């Protein structure tokens, strides 16, 4: 099927991807306040399928390591969120044969919200408090089925966001891991055998986010 390769060593945290996800789906904006960070919205929610997480880590000499993490569903090869919801209703969560997109349907209102969230190793699924529907990054399955790139990928200026067939993407990831290691010698691929969104981390993935890897 299809795969994302996210080279986080190229991210400028411009948040094009964040804005572009909402423009494409015409999602609403959250009420936000600055709480002493550029990071906003602070977390994913029913109306936010992607936010960029900002982490400042100390280093010897001038400046810092500024870690940027554009978060989305990993579209896992063996989705735990499906496996959970399939005990309640075999339909709420489905897998597209062609792309490998894990898609939440309208029947997610007929399952346990927290149960499907807890089963996800990456803490991705979010609940609408009114209607109890589950929402998350849907991979722009719509767009991919019509030969278009996902909005977050097309809009990214740095080459951080990359999309295509899993054969080319695993080829790009392994070649790029080799070249980025020359600069960031602790650079790793996030769960690259279990997911369709393969992040390249410049160091310990857990510095980017607690749930960055399983």
């Amino acid at each position: 099927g299809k795969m994302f390769f996210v080279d986080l060593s190229r991210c400028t945290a411009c948040r094009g991807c964040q804005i572009a996800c909402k423009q494409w789906k015409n999602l609403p904006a959250e009420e936000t306040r600055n709480t002493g960070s550029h990071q906003n919205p602070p977390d994913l929610s029913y109306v936010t399928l992607k936010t960029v997480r900002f982490t400042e880590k100390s280093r010897k000499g001038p400046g810092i390591d500024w870690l940027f993490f554009p978060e989305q569903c990993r579209h896992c090869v063996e989705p735990p969120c499906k496996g959970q919801a399939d005990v309640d209703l075999e339909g709420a969560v489905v897998k597209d044969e062609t792309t490998g997109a894990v898609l939440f349907t309208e029947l997610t209102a007929k399952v346990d919200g927290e149960s499907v969230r807890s089963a996800c190793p990456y803490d991705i699924p979010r609940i609408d408090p009114v209607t109890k529907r589950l929402s998350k990054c849907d991979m722009c399955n719509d767009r991919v089925q019509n030969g278009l790139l996902p909005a977050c990928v097309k809009t990214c200026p740095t080459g951080t966001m990359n999309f295509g067939d899993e054969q080319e993407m695993l080829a790009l990831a392994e070649k790029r891991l080799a070249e980025v290691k020359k600069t960031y010698p602790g650079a790793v691929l996030g769960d690259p055998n279990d997911v369709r969104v393969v992040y390249l981390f410049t160091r310990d993935p857990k510095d980017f986010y607690e749930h960055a890897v399983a």
Partner: protein, 963 residues
Amino acid sequence: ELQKLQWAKQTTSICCYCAVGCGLIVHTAKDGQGRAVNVEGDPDHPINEGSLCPKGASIFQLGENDQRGTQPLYRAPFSDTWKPVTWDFALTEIAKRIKKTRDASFTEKNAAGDLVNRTEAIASFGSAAMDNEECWAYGNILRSLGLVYIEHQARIXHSPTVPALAESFGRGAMTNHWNDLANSDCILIMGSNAAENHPIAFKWVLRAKDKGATLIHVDPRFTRTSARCDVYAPIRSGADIPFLGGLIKYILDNKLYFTDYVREYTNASLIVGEKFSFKDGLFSGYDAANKKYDKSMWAFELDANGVPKRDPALKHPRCVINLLKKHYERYNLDKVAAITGTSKEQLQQVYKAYAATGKPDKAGTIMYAMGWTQHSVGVQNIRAMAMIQLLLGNIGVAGGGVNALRGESNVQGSTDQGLLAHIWPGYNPVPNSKAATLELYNAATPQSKDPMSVNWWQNRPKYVASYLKALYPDEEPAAAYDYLPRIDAGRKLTDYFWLNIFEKMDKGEFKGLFAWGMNPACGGANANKNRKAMGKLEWLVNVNLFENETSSFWKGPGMNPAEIGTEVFFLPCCVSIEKEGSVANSGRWMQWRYRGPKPYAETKPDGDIMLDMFKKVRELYAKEGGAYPAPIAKLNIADWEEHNEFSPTKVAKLMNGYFLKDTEVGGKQFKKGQQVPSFAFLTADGSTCSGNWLHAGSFTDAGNLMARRDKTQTPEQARIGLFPNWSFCWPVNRRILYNRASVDKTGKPWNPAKAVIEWKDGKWVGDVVDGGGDPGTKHPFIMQTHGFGALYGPGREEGPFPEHYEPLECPVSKNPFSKQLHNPVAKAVCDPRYPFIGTTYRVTEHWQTGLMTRRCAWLVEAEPQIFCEISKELAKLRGIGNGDTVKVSSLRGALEAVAIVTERIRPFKIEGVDVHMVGLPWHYGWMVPKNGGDTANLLTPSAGDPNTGIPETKAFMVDVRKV
């Protein structure tokens, strides 16, 4: 199919924000009849390749916004409310206001009895947001009405650049273009935060890195740019010349200069007259009384023919190169390391990495935007970058250049159309009271007796004449020259500029102001002074997308509408994707964009607003008569409109120019009405018109070259990304300027693997050669009088060599390089209640004062409130917690902000004292959103530099307190 786009018409547009010029695709409902349904990136566009930063990405939410103005609004004197009115009402009442103020205040002759034909009772602000055809039309509308106070954005950020680079190279423009960044072997980003402020640029910067380039960020703060550079070097505010001088010394000491490039193409070999000296921070010819230099003392020694003397051996001790060597010997690593706050080891790292591009087959580029070039030695800061680039052979070459990043989408275009007080379109100076005739005007152009010096500016008379013939085609240029206003020769030039317009407004010396596509209530330094001063206006015209802090200053913070007697007209204009026309990006790429949806509600393109407005004035002057009507009545506006509408197309064709009769020029015959194919074929005798000589070549008989979307490239063009069939750049589609300097005298590139031009068969292959003639038969810098890239620049007010003068008054009491502390050709208080250095800068998500982006929910979502970025060191001292509310105050005003404590800010060491720097975004204002905050320009001084007339926004004294 995708339901969202299925039934929508698809058109192309160019981003309405920054000067990268990213391509958009717009989808419009009902096969183009209705509203936009989608806006995202143009995947075919060679600059952005479909990518958009969050500002471009959110243009749908800018366009299809319910908060946008719907119709003209009217505020009566002393009224506390807006009253909706028709276009017919608004423009007639404004046309009356223009004519009344003008008739009353018009001056044929000044005190000295010199003809000027002007009114000083009306000033205009704006704008780089408008289309190029709109900017040109606007400039010419205002000048026919006799205005001299015509300013815009360009004054604040791109005015200390045009002179710096003009002195150095012959033109004031960005030397290369965005795609060319990918060809650089070392990228130095200094006075720029491009990852946030020109984000798509970082596509090509990181592609440079993929091919082995080193990326260097030199900034007082660690930014999103720093995060992605190989080397981050902290520098304390205004220490840039020490840093750049230390590099010039490093290059000469280690002999890392491109020797052949320097000898042939720079003025290294020119002999400077014996009256040039430099002693203790002053050059020769200094006048202590008038704080000004007699620059005649800096003259080159001339041979019998008047041509500067040259020693190609570079032996004569009065060679530019030898005087340069001597001047920069004071800038050793210890002194530079001490003052910049940059470690000795980190200077060596940055100097080695960058000076390595002195190799003929290696190219280094410098990227700077606004940084801190605001002060009086901003021009000298840039001069040093030019000089380093001439030393290393980096001017003219792929991956080289001085990449002076422009700010707005069309600030390059709006400056090119003469929306500053000192220039007509095409950088022909606004004639002064002593240029009594067109003949005198034209006699001011220097000549050269060097036969190898093209000296293109000798063609000025053909451009001025062709210009006058575009405005007044029935008159002889000689006669038309009397219609347009003149500035006083006796008066200082800065008196006509941005900051003095705010001084004059506060002294009640203006009746009307045009705030056309700007938000001065937030944009101007010392916002409290300016907001009060707008209360001393008789009438105000604000043309904008939304109601704002300027349109509604009269009901601002601490204001009583009742007492404020200013009459305000708010005209709502249509967005970028709702009109056709051209914007000129930073690389001079003049790109055509189309209408997607029809204008929102009763909004109009600026073209129709300004044209209808002028038509009302004009018919008013046909009825009532009044002050000197000839300039208004004779103006050729028929060439501007088609089907009762402002025609972007026709205006573009006029700006390019056409023959007004059958003409022979450059041994070719042309028929009356035919489009001028290039500025090479313009005339001074009245055969040709051309609104802007730079535009001559842009819209020919061949068609509209700005509208080309052709990615065809030869191998040599594709290797460096010239894309010459993608739109059109001035001059005459020369993508990289001074490219004649990229080849030797046989016409072979220094770097064949990245050739800009090459002499093959008997022709130049690659880019358009910047100057005609065979290899080794012309000096490469054709807009230069003498033809050379200038290391020694004796036209600069501060001296012919950049020298360090402290731009920080308060925390510095001694200069390590001379007895001279401050700029000797230039009274801050430094009240110890304000012990910190306040600075203002941008985030990726917001635009300018935020008038636009504070109305976009997705941008507010990411950056909802004015913040104050401080170091851990200063958060310890004032007991500030990350997220705590704080109070930032100065002598000018005070505001609340959310504290961001970060290691990205650090204390500077200035004369063995920890000096804390605090940072604010100027993207916020009282109108929107709720809890957003007001402008950081509440805190900034309106005390500017007599040199530049630009106020201080990057180093101003504040206090910050927990609340």
